Amino acid sequence: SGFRKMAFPSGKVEGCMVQVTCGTTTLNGLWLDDVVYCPRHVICTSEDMLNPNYEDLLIRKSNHNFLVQAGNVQLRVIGHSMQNCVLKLKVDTANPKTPKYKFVRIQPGQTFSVLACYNGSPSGVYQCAMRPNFTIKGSFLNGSCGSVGFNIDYDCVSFCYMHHMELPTGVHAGTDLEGNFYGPFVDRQTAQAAGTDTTITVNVLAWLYAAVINGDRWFLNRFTTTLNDFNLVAMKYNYEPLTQDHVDILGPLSAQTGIAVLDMCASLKELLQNGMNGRTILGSALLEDEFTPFDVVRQCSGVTFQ
Amino acid sequence: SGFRKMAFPSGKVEGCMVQVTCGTTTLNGLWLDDVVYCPRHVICTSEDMLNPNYEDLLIRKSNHNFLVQAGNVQLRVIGHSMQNCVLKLKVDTANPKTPKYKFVRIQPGQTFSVLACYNGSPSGVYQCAMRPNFTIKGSFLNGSCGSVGFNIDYDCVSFCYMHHMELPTGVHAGTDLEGNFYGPFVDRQTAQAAGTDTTITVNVLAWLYAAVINGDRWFLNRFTTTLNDFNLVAMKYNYEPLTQDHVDILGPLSAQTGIAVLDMCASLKELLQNGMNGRTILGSALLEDEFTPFDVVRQCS
Ligand SMILES: CCCOc1ccc(NC(=O)[C@@H]2CC(=O)Nc3ccccc32)cc1OCCC
Ligand SMILES: CCCOc1ccc(NC(=O)[C@@H]2CC(=O)Nc3ccccc32)cc1OCCC
Ligand SMILES: [Br-]
Ligand SMILES: [Br-]
Ligand SMILES: [Br-]
Ligand SMILES: [Cl-]
Ligand code: NA
């Protein structure tokens, strides 16, 4: 029993964090095999924050303009290249702690663990979701650029996020490990406001299924809804549309609890209408939207508390 | 910017987790030096668990009754003993991944990271507080017993919790690593209940300071209070007493934001009396009590 924001165990990723210095700037890199990945903005000065030309800034650098430190050991840089918004530094030593890994680009609503690091040293681990407006609501201070997000299903690390910047509204923007930004964001300090964010409806449904698996039903009702009528209502509360793909994804949680997906949708419509009347659901007084269907199946029992 | 429930990185602890099997029971153990620590209830059948005589049940066991697996490798048990509610298995191999560590017993209101494990394999990490009623609101399924809780300081892991049992309300109970239970619980199948819990006042104040550091100020007001008047309101609302030691501990956050603890205490008194009037704090509609002053300072600087 219980239900917590649950991160993956971080050790496989801790063994990959290094410090990258270019000029007066130090940030984090990811050391996998003989490559160190980091944000390309490490090569920007005071004067390069609005309209950097990264090709022009990089051609000016030699291998020895990059310092990579792994614990107390300097790694020698023997090559460099830029892929989209990531710098790749080839080093003379392969990381002996490199885990089984892959790079994945995720979609809005997907979750991952963030290993927040400073000076190449891990500070803490927490869960995040890719918001519908392609930001993350992280917890990051100066020095955390290059911290990464990942999942570790099936003993393979799936890296999905590298942290680049905090936007003026205090949310966070970054790239996949091929250096493509999530969303319309660019590595410039020009205005680029996040879209108004919305609630990840499929994840709220998943979390209501978790609440039923863990033993609570108070919020259910005798109604159903069509998918169209559900979306017409949910949109009035700035919830994302629920697609037939989302309904399919919820199938297993529906089968485990005996609650049809459109019947759980009718419960959510009534919670949006009514509130909780002083009750909580899994310890929350607000509807939670950063647990995916897959996350619920990862953490909850396979046997409902009936 | 931002504020999240954050666990310590778990790698130092991941390298210590093993699987312990006694007869038909598999659970987790903690491998440090040449000793594996796990819950002593591993020696019990279902029948024994209703009224165990652990002295006698352990007399009936030998080294060969215990199988310890670290990944793919059997560790040979060469001795066994109990310390309180923990079984200690001496093994033929010192863990080469043993971190710098201490065993520390924590106080109610203190937080710690839990590495939830199954079959000796780490599955997840989350942050927990020791409640005032000495339970934790964990997330555990069958096979999680022997999962551990810890804090880090520099390169030193402070192990504070070993998981033993789930209580009927779905909260969790366990021991320190010397086998002493937190709370008035026993490792037997008999009627046990969580006592009525209270809210950790000093932590709520820490979290209001976090909210101010992060720009949420709507709950601030012109008023101050006294420690005596505040404690009468805390008692009324099922909050723990605030001590002068708590006021001193909030010194550095009070220093960082320049809001005296008794000024913030007047905000909390108003929130308890009047509610949040439809507003949130750090995205929560509830007053959060599982961040310590240290947790807030650690994450905000
Ligand atoms: C060439 C352009 C590069 O631009 C940036 C580069 C780096 C950052 N660094 C940060 O955000 C860090 C890490 C973090 O998440 N929060 C935080 C908080 C306080 C101080 C520092 C930070 C920001 C930039 O642009 C911000 C405006 C779009
Ligand atoms: C000897 C200690 C008293 O005997 C027990 C021995 C073991 C357990 N095992 C569990 O709770 C596990 C782990 C967990 O946290 N939740 C969970 C959920 C479903 C199935 C199994 C579990 C419980 C006991 O007593 C329960 C009443 C106090
Ligand atoms: Br007022
Ligand atoms: Br006053
Ligand atoms: Br809440
Ligand atoms: Cl503290
Ligand atoms: Na005040």
Per residue, the 3-state secondary structure of chain A, as one string, reads CCCCCCECCCHHHHCCEEEEEECCEEEEEEEECCEEEEEHHHHCCHHHCCCCCHHHHHHCCCHHHEEEEECCEEECEEEEEEECCEEEEEECCCCCCCCCEEECCCCCCCEEEEEEEECCEEEEEEEEECCCCCCECCCCCCCCCCCEEEECHHHCEEEEEEEEEECCCCCEEEECCCCCECCCCCCCCCCCCCCCCCECHHHHHHHHHHHHHCCCCCCCCCCCCCHHHHHHHHHHCCECCCCHHHHHHCHHHHHHHCCCHHHHHHHHHHHHHHCCCCCCECCECCCCCCCCHHHHHHHCCCCCCC
A92 with A124, same domain: the answer is: no
Q: Are B286 and B202 in contact (CB under 8 A)?
A: no
A25-32 and A17-22 strand pairing = antiparallel
B292 sits in which H/E element: none
Query: Å resolution of this model?
Result: 1.3
Residue A237 belongs to domain with CATH number? 1.10.1840.10
Same domain, A222 and A265: yes
Q: Give the end of a domain, one of B99, B119, B152.
A: B99
Structure tokens at B208: 């209001």
Question: Whole-angstrom Cα distance, residue A58 to residue A77?
Answer: 14
Match 């917590």 to its residue by tokens: A4
- Give the 3-state secondary structure of B183-249: CCCCCCCCCCCCCCCCECHHHHHHHHHHHHHCCCCCCCCCCCCCHHHHHHHHHHCCECCCCHHHHHH
Strand partners, A231: none
The answer to whether the CB of B142 is under 6 A from ligand 2 is: yes
Answer for the pair B203, B289: CB distance below 8 angstroms, yes or no. yes
The dihedral sign for the CA sequence B202, B205, B211, B213: negative
Positive or negative: CA dihedral A66, A67, A70, A75: positive
Nearest to B203 by CA among B82, B295, B69, B74: B295
Q: Which residues of A touch B1 (CB under 8 A)?
A: 139-140, 166, 170
* Cα–Cα dist B66/B23, whole Å: 8
Tokens of A32: 């996998």
The three-state secondary structure class of B167 is coil
Residue A5 with chain B: CB contacts under 8 Å: 5, 126
Q: Which of A93, A114, A142 is nearest to A13 (CA)?
A: A114
Beta bridge partners of B172: B136, B166
Q: Among B47, B48, B145, B181, which residue has the most ligand 2 atoms within 8 Å of its CB, making it the best to mutate?
A: B145
The answer on B127 and B48 residing in a single domain is no
* Matching residue, tokens 């995205």: B283
Return d(Cα B253, Cα B259) in angstroms, integer: 8
Q: How far apart are CA B86 and CA B88, in angstroms?
A: 6
Residue B287 CB neighbour total at 10 angstroms: 19
Closest CA to A150 of A113, A175, A178: A113
- Interchain contact B125–A (C-beta under 8 A): yes
State the Cα–Cα distance between residues A27 and A221, nearest whole angstrom: 52
**CA-wise closest residue to A2 among B147, B163, B290, B171:** B171
Question: Nearest bound ligand to CA B151?
Answer: 6
What value, to the nearest 5°, has the Cα angle with vertex B203 and ends B199 and B206? 145
Q: Classify strands A111-118 and A121-129 as parallel, antiparallel or unpaired.
A: antiparallel
Domain span holding position B301: 198-301
Looking at A197, A213, A245, the residue that finishes a domain is A197
Residue nearest to atom 21 of ligand 1 (CA): A142
Catalytic residue (one of A16, A22, A38, A41):
A41
Q: List residues, by chain if needed, whose CB lies under 5 Å from ion ligand 3.
A: B 221
A63 lies in some domain? yes
In degrees to the nearest 10, what's the CA dihedral of A37, A43, A44, A45?
A: 140
- Would you say residue A104 lies in a domain? yes
Can you tell me which residue has the tokens 């919820």?
Answer: A250
- Torsion A118-B116-B208-A193 (CA) sign: positive
- B119 vs B98: CA distance, rounded Å: 20
Question: Cα dist. A17→A20, A204, B163 in Å?
Answer: 10, 33, 31
Looking at the structure, tell me whether residues B287 and B231 fall in a common domain: yes
Q: Cα dist. A75→A67, A116, A255, A294 in Å?
A: 7, 22, 53, 39
- Using the Cβ of A115 and the Cβ atoms of chain B, whether some distance falls under 8 Å is answered with yes
CA distance B37 to B35: 6
Q: Are residues A4 and A126 in the same domain?
A: yes
Same domain, A95 and A27: yes
Whether residue A306 is contained in a domain is answered as: no
Number of structural domains chain B divides into: 3
Tell me the three state secondary structure of residue B181. strand
Q: Is residue A42 part of a domain?
A: yes
- How far apart are the C-alpha atoms of B290 and B292, rounded to whole Å? 6
C-alpha–C-alpha distance, residues B170 and A51, integer Å = 55
Sheet holding A35-39, edge to edge: A73-75, A66-70, A17-22, A25-32, A35-39, A86-91, A77-83
Parallel, antiparallel or unpaired: strands B17-22 and B25-32: antiparallel
Parallel, antiparallel or unpaired: strands B156-166 and B100-103: parallel
Nearest CA to ligand 1 atom 6: A165
Considering every ligand atom shown, identify the ligand nearest to the alpha carbon of residue B266 and give its number. Answer: 7
Q: How far apart are CA A31 and CA A15, in angstroms?
A: 8
| Pair of tokens at residue B168 | 């009927």
> Touching check for B5 and chain A: CB below 8 Å?
yes
Give every strand in the sheet of B17-22, ordered side by side: B73-75, B66-70, B17-22, B25-32, B35-39, B86-91, B77-83
Residue A149 in contact with ligand 1 by CB distance below 6 A:
no
Contact between B164 and B171 under an 8 Å Cβ cutoff? The reply is: no
Residues B226, B293, single domain; the answer is yes
Q: How far is A256 from chain B (nearest CA, A)?
A: 17
Query: What CA–CA distance (Å, rounded) separates B21 from B7?
Result: 29
Q: CA B147 from chain center: how many Å? A: 11
For residue B225, give Cα distances in angstroms to B221, B230, B231, B258: 11, 6, 10, 16
CA distance between the termini of chain A? 13
- Please say which residue of A197, A214, A233 terminates a domain: A197
Tell me which of B145, B163, B164, B172 is the catalytic residue: B145
Q: Are residues A278 and A222 in the same domain?
A: yes
Contacts of A104 (CB under 8 A, 6+ apart): A158, A159, A160, A176
Return the residue whose CA atom lies nearest to atom 21 of ligand 2.
Answer: B142
| Cα A247 from Cα B51, distance rounded (Å) | 49
User: Domain holding A182: CATH number?
Assistant: 2.40.10.10
For residue B261, which ligand has an atom nearest its CA? Answer: 7
Assess whether B152 and B285 both reside in one domain.
no
Q: b/e per residue, A222-256, with b = 16+ CB within 10 A? A: eeebebeebbebbeeeebbebeeebbebbeebbeb
Query: Quick one: which H or E segment has residue B263?
Result: helix B261-274
Q: B172: which DSSP letter?
A: E
Q: Is B80 in the active site?
A: no
Eight-state DSSP code of residue B296:
H
Question: Is B145 considered catalytic here?
Answer: yes
Q: In 3D, which of B144, B142, B106, B151 has the Cα closest to residue B123? A: B144
Ligand 2 contact, B40 CB (< 6 A): no
In sequence order, the 6+-apart residues with CB closer than 8 A to the CB of B275 are: none
Give yes or no for a contact between A40 and A86, defined as CB atoms under 8 angstroms apart. yes
Strand partners, A114: A126, A149
Q: How far is CA A175 from the centre of its chain?
A: 10
Query: Cβ distance B149 to B9 under 8 Å?
Result: no
* In a shared domain, residues A152 and A168: yes
Catalytic residue among B41, B80, B163, B172: B41
Q: Which residues pair with A38 in a beta bridge?
A: A87
User: Tokens standing for B210?
Assistant: 């976090």
Same domain, A88 and A117: no
C-alpha of residue B277 to centroid of ligand 3, in Å: 12
Contacts of B174 in chain A (CB under 8 A): none
**DSSP at B284:** B
Distance CA B176, CA A2 (A): 21
Rounded Cα–Cα distance for residues A94 and A91 (Å): 7
Q: Is B100 helix (H, G, I), strand (E, B) or coil?
A: strand
Q: Tokens 């892991």: give the residue.
A: B157
d(CA A92, CA B34): 37
Identify which of B12, B124, B285 has the shortest CB distance to residue A286: B285
Closest CA to A274 of A233, A306, A240: A233
Element (H, E) at B82: strand B77-83
Residue type, A305: F
DSSP assignment of B22-77 equals: ETTEEEEEEEETTEEEEEGGGG--HHHHTS--HHHHHHT--GGGEEEEETTEEEPE
What dihedral angle (degrees, nearest 10) is formed by the CA atoms of B271, B3, B297, B173? Answer: 80
3-state SS class at B113: strand
CA distance B57 to B65: 12
Torsion angle (degrees, nearest 10) of CA A152, A157, A158, A160: 100
CB A174 within 8 A of CB A103: no
Q: How is residue B100 written in tokens?
A: 């710098």
Q: How far, CA to CA in Å, does A167 sit from each of A50, A53, A123, A176?
A: 14, 21, 22, 17
Same domain? For B213 and B235 the reply is yes
CA gap A106, A182 in Å, rounded: 9
Q: What is the DSSP letter of B10?
A: -
Interface test with B, best of A17, A121, A139, A305 (most B CBs within 10 A): A139
- The Cα B290–Cα B203 span in angstroms is 6
